[PDB]
Amino acid sequence: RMGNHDMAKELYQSLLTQVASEHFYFWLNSLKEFSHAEQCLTGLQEENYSSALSCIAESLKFYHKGIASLTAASTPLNPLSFQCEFVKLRIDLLQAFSQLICTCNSLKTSPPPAIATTDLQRCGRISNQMKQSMEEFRSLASRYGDLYQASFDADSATLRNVELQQQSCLLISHAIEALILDPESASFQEYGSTGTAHADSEYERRMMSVYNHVLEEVESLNRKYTPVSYMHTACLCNAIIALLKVPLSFQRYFFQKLQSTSIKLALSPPIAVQNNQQLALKVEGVVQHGSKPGLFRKIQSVCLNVS
Amino acid sequence: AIQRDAVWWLHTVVPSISKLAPKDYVHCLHKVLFTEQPETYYKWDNWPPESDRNFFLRLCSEVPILEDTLMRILVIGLSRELPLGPADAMELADHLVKRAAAVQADDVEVLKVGRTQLIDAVLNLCTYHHPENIQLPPGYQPPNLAISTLYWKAWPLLLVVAAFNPENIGLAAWEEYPTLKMLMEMVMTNNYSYPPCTLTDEETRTEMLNRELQTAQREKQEILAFEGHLAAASTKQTITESSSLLLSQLTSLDPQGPPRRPPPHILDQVKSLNQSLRLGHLLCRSRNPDFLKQRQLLGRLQDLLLGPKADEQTTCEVLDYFLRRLGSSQVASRVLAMKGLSLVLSDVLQGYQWLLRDLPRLPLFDSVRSTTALALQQAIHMETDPQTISAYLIYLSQHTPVEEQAQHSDLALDVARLVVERSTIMSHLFSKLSPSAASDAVLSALLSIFSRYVRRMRQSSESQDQVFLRWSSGETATMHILVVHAMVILLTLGPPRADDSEFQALLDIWFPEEKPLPTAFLVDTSEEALLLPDWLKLRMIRSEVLRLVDAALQDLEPQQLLLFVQSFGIPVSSMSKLLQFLDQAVAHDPQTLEQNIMDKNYMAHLVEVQHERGASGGQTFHSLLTASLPP
Amino acid sequence: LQFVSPFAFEAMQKVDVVCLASLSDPELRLLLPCLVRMALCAPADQSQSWAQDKKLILRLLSGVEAVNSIVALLSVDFHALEQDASKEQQLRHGLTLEFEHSDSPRRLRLVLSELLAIMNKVSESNGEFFFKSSELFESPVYLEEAADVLCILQAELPSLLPIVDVAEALLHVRNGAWFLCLLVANVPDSFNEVCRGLIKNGERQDEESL
């Protein structure tokens, strides 16, 4: 929870051979592998991008081991859906980070001369690669939002953690856009309405400090260089380093599920309908609960989308 | 147990309602076969379930012979009005055979024919049937025309039946069509190619077919000339030989003629499955009728050629036919020819030891020595395998026809073309990472042949590019430019470890120490020939022998020096010498900056890199270059 | 046949140059076209550290005689080649001996035409697997030269030769795995997209067919 992942790795490793059930064994092994993966990228130097690429590769190896174990730990009436999606979105945005480290280094593979003779296309392959990275990070932010709004039963701190991850995705996407793809349409300045925001955790403070520093770096580098610049890649890669150097926090919903609200959704029915007569479908549903219903939030209304 | 077919079951109501036309009945019979794969019906919506189709397909692939076909054949024979064609059955059998190859097994019936109507089908297919729409004049025989689909479908199925089961069905093909024996020979050769390796009998197959084809074509043209006037009187349509529709839809029944070579496109697709099927095993048993099973012809050609009964004419013709393929642009042709030649003939170059040990022992080797040498010389410019070229060079070094000046000049020109033009082959043969014993033998062979050529020329202009050579020692010689460039390239490769006498002799005669170079003049115009072009000079600079480097760097005009420093792969010693000469030129001619040096920064970095490697010199050039712009 | 080492690919992906210096010459020759492009073409970084790294790359390349062929390939006017390829594609809808005797633009045209033919074959098919006998990806001697020209074409004509379509095309030739591996090694940031495209286009295995 507090990001001491080496200690967590040691303790989870100790806890193996103590459990009796194999799915709990896989769950603890997955926790050990996630702790090891997060411990792997604690040794990031401020400017060493090659070391960063190697560390992210090691972390991704351990994360893939962990997600295989976690999938092995999933059972009926304990599907670990939030855990699986959360660590899958953690595996992404790390291989997306690796691809952006590669595209940092792609600038050293020179552009063609045919294209070089006549603005963004003159960059060469790196321009299209930055476009692809921007789209990938935007899709990652959308997926993090999807995880957020599929977490109705999660506590507030977990939702704030998911928000922080989504905001990191959006930060990288905005940095790519404003430095490479559309510096003229960079919009207003990064005027933080919150200013000195009242963070609820040290992870929150570190995340917002990283965001503010990256936005300050981007703003000071807006139109000072052409998009062929090594300084744009330097700022992006340094943003990667800053985002990864703050250890990930596994929040309460990753371990404990408390609210557990569902919907039964019994609807009136391989059913034959005439062409002229259009179907009259009635859907009835009951919201279910486990113990204290409205622990974190209460259902005000139910939206039923039919397609 | 059933005596009827699916066609009959469908026709029970179809013909009852209204008697359908013959074309409609034929189409219904063809569609009723149901030879398609049932597993492909559930690839769109996953319906019907596929859990049973997989189990049913394995048992359906191997099927027995039913009596329903025999009952239908008997009914068709007993009734003259019965409209039942064997084309649908042939198409179904062909489809089943094609599908079964993927899931074939020893305990699975690949093919099974239960009806003996092959003779009846053949008789009914070659006969002419009056069409409903077209009515020919009474008493006049119309031309023999057949549907393209039926003719194309009857050939493959019948050929497969005759080849796979040549016991009973093969007897008919063993007395009518020698093409069946030719195809059996091709199958035994394990190569579906026209001409096959086992069809080498040119005097029996190629010659007779070629002689007969011209007569047959002339007779067909003469027969068609009379009918053309009547055909044109009704249609009034133009006829052209290249646009003749009947040529691609009808063909004369001439089984005795040569087989038809398939197009390269069909052959390319066929070769992918040919190795997968491995059809060569089935042809070893077939020996009746015999076309001339490949082992029997191998032994026959062996005792005809290796033995004391060998004759000049047939052996010379066979070798000419067999070696003209090496000069072809097809790698498959030359590989098959190589393999066949090694097998017919028969511890270093084991796969090529036949050409080095077996061929000279022949009784009539001297009679055929010239033609094989010419064939190898032509094959040098086509062959791509380094080992094959190595074997060819070694043979064309030990067994070299020397007596004729013309022949020796042509051989030197061909080897020079190999050395100069085939740069990738030359680099591959003597790649510096692996000096092999075969490489040593080839290098010794090359220097030996070139030394003998230059010596024989010295002891003594057909081509325009001949150059009149002069030495400082008083000798005269007339040679090509390519051969000089070739010996220079040989000398850049360094001395062999097996022998050094020929290398040193060549290096001494061409570039003697502290003596003027052999100035070359054209034979016709008598002007100073450029025997050492820029590319060749750069090639000898990269050599590790100091004499070639010293000869190359003499009186170098600064544009050439600037070009050479920009090149890559130059050793450190040669780079230091080049930079020393560059410094001397800079001190003696500062004006090399204007119309030679395109850019200052890149060449400055180049000179810095040369110094970083550990090359001396270039300080004055570096100073002059840095004076224009900072690094 | 020798493939690109994981150590060399890791060095190339990180562009760690002292690592590339400590490499064997047969391994280095696989990475030759890209390294030549980074050593000779105008730098896009324009940073002093990258200038020094470029100098070390040039030093490491100076000792290789095979670089001159790649320099010759890089001297071709690619505008005319692009125009010719586009016009030929609009028109649409010994070969190895010719490649050997050809100068740099002509052999570039030959291999580019063959690549576009294979791409058209791929696009026309709905997924059916063919096998185009090329005689230039098959000859063991000419694999190095063909691979160098392939890398230079992909680098200098990126719009006309997208990496994923080259990868999908290369599966149909005899030695396509080696060509694809060294192609990805020469543009290391294309690994993820090449793998994604290969997996996405892998829709019909036909029970583990060819």
Interface contact flag, B384 C142, Cβ < 8 Å: yes
Our CA-based measurement puts residue C192 at a distance from the nearest CA of chain B, in whole angstroms, of 30
Contacts of C16 in chain A (CB under 8 A): 50
Contacts of A103 in chain C (CB under 8 A): 189
CB pairs under 8 A between B and C: 63
What is the DSSP annotation of B313-379? Answer: HHHHHHHHHHHTTTTSS-HHHHHHHHHHHHHHH---SGGGHIIIIIGGGSTTHHHHHHHHHHHHHHH
Adjacent-strand bridge partners of A263: A287
Interface contact flag, B421 C101, Cβ < 8 Å: yes
Q: Which of B506, B496, B355, B504 is nearest to B439 (CA)?
A: B496
3-state helix, strand, coil in chain B (%, to 5): 60, 0, 40
Q: Looking at chain C, which residue has its C-alpha nearest residue B272?
A: C131
Q: Which of C25, C2, C15 is nearest to C182 (CA)?
A: C2
Contacts of B382 in chain C (CB under 8 A): 94, 97
State the best of C10, C13, C193 to mutate against chain A, taking most chain A CBs within 10 Å: C13
The answer to whether residue B421 neighbours chain C at the CB level (below 8 Å) is yes
What phi, psi does A154 have (nearest 5°)?
Answer: -80, 150
CA torsion C155-C160-C163-C167 (nearest 10°) is -120
How many angstroms separate the CA atoms of B604 and B621, rounded?
A: 9
Q: Looking at chain C, which residue has its C-alpha nearest residue A53?
A: C14
* CA dist A286 → A76, A258, B46 (Å): 22, 19, 35
SS3 B450: helix
Neighbours of B171 (CB within 10 A): 13
Interface contact flag, A49 C14, Cβ < 8 Å: yes
* A86, A138 Cβ separation under 8 angstroms: no
Q: Is the peptide bond before B195 cis (omega within 30 degrees of 0)?
A: yes
Q: Two tokens at A236?
A: 């992006």
Contacts of A122 in chain C (CB under 8 A): none
Show the beta-strand stretches assigned E in B137-186. Answer: none
Interface contact flag, B608 C96, Cβ < 8 Å: no
Put simply, the chain A residues between 254 and 283 with a CB less than 8 A from any chain C CB are none
Interface contact flag, A102 C37, Cβ < 8 Å: no
State the best of B54, B99, B271, B609 to mutate against chain C, taking most chain C CBs within 10 Å: B609
Evaluated on CA atoms B199, B202, B203, B207, the torsion sign reads positive
Neighbours of A155 (CB within 10 A): 18
Q: Is C128 left (phi over 0), alpha (psi -120 to 50) or beta?
A: beta
Of A99, A105, A125, which has the smallest distance from its Cβ to C15's Cβ?
A105
Tell me whether chains A and B touch (3+ CB pairs under 8 A): no
Our CA-based measurement puts residue C96 at a distance from the nearest CA of chain B, in whole angstroms, of 9
**Given the structure tokens 């020759």, which residue do they identify?**
C29
Neighbours of B537 (CB within 10 A): 20
Q: Is B236 left (phi over 0), alpha (psi -120 to 50) or beta?
A: left
State the best of B380, B568, B605 to mutate against chain C, taking most chain C CBs within 10 Å: B568
Which of the other chains make 3 or more beta carbon contacts under 8 angstroms with chain B?
A: C
Q: Please return the burial class of A145, using the count of CB atoms within 10 Å of its CB with bins 0-12, 13-18 and 19+.
A: middle
Cα maximum dimension of chain A? 70
Of C42, C78, C188, which has the smallest distance from its Cβ to A102's Cβ?
C188
* A180, A227 Cβ separation under 8 angstroms: yes
How many angstroms separate the CA atoms of B255 and B177, rounded?
A: 5
How many angstroms separate the CA atoms of C206 and C129, rounded?
A: 10
Interface contact flag, C62 B613, Cβ < 8 Å: yes
Interface contact flag, B424 C142, Cβ < 8 Å: yes
Contacts of C66 in chain B (CB under 8 A): 569
How many angstroms separate the CA atoms of C155 and C40, rounded?
A: 14
Of C37, C47, C187, which has the smallest distance from its Cβ to A230's Cβ?
C47
* A265, A283 Cβ separation under 8 angstroms: yes
The answer to whether residue A230 neighbours chain C at the CB level (below 8 Å) is yes
Q: Which of B382, B380, B324, B415 is nearest to C95 (CA)?
A: B382
Interface contact flag, C38 A50, Cβ < 8 Å: no
Which are the contacts of A149, defined by CB distance < 8 A and separation ≥ 6? none
Adjacent-strand bridge partners of A284: A266
State the best of C141, C206, C209 to mutate against chain B, taking most chain B CBs within 10 Å: C141
Contacts of B429 in chain C (CB under 8 A): none
Q: Please return the burial class of C100, using the count of CB atoms within 10 Å of its CB with bins 0-12, 13-18 and 19+.
A: buried
* C29, C5 Cβ separation under 8 angstroms: no
Question: What's the half-sphere exposure (Cβ side, CA atoms, 13 Å) at A187?
Answer: 7
* B396, B442 Cβ separation under 8 angstroms: no
Q: Which residues of B446-475 are buried (b: 16+ CB within 10 A; e: fewer)?
A: bbbbbbbbbeebeeeeeeeebbbbebeeee
The answer to whether residue B325 neighbours chain C at the CB level (below 8 Å) is no
* CA dist A135 → A96, A183, A235, B158 (Å): 11, 16, 19, 61
Tell me whether chains B and C touch (3+ CB pairs under 8 A): yes
* A161, A248 Cβ separation under 8 angstroms: no
For B48-56, the CB contacts below 8 A with 24+ separation are: none
Which are the contacts of B228, defined by CB distance < 8 A and separation ≥ 6? B239
Resolution of the experimental model in angstroms, please?
3.1
What is the DSSP annotation of A177-236? Answer: IIIII-GGG--S----SSSS---SSHHHHHHHHHHHHHHHHHHTTSSSS-TT-HHHHHHH
Element (DSSP H or E) covering residue A160: helix A156-176
One-letter amino acid of A66: G
What phi, psi does B125 have (nearest 5°)?
Answer: -80, -35
The answer to whether residue C105 neighbours chain A at the CB level (below 8 Å) is no
Interface contact flag, C65 B608, Cβ < 8 Å: no
Q: Is the peptide bond before B289 cis (omega within 30 degrees of 0)?
A: yes
Interface contact flag, B610 C133, Cβ < 8 Å: no
Q: Is C34 left (phi over 0), alpha (psi -120 to 50) or beta?
A: alpha
* CA dist B496 → B300, B449, B535, B545, C175 (Å): 44, 15, 24, 12, 34
CA angle, residues B410, B414, B417, in degrees to nearest 5: 135
Structure solved via: cryo-EM
* CA dist A156 → A153, A188, A252, B503, B518 (Å): 9, 31, 9, 87, 93
Q: Which of B244, B194, B189 is nearest to B220 (CA)?
A: B244
CB pairs under 8 A between A and C: 81
The answer to whether residue C87 neighbours chain B at the CB level (below 8 Å) is no
Our CA-based measurement puts residue C104 at a distance from the nearest CA of chain B, in whole angstroms, of 14
What is the DSSP annotation of B421-440? Answer: H-HHHHHHHT-TT---HHHH
Q: Please return the burial class of B264, using the count of CB atoms within 10 Å of its CB with bins 0-12, 13-18 and 19+.
A: exposed
State the best of B384, B563, B576 to mutate against chain C, taking most chain C CBs within 10 Å: B384
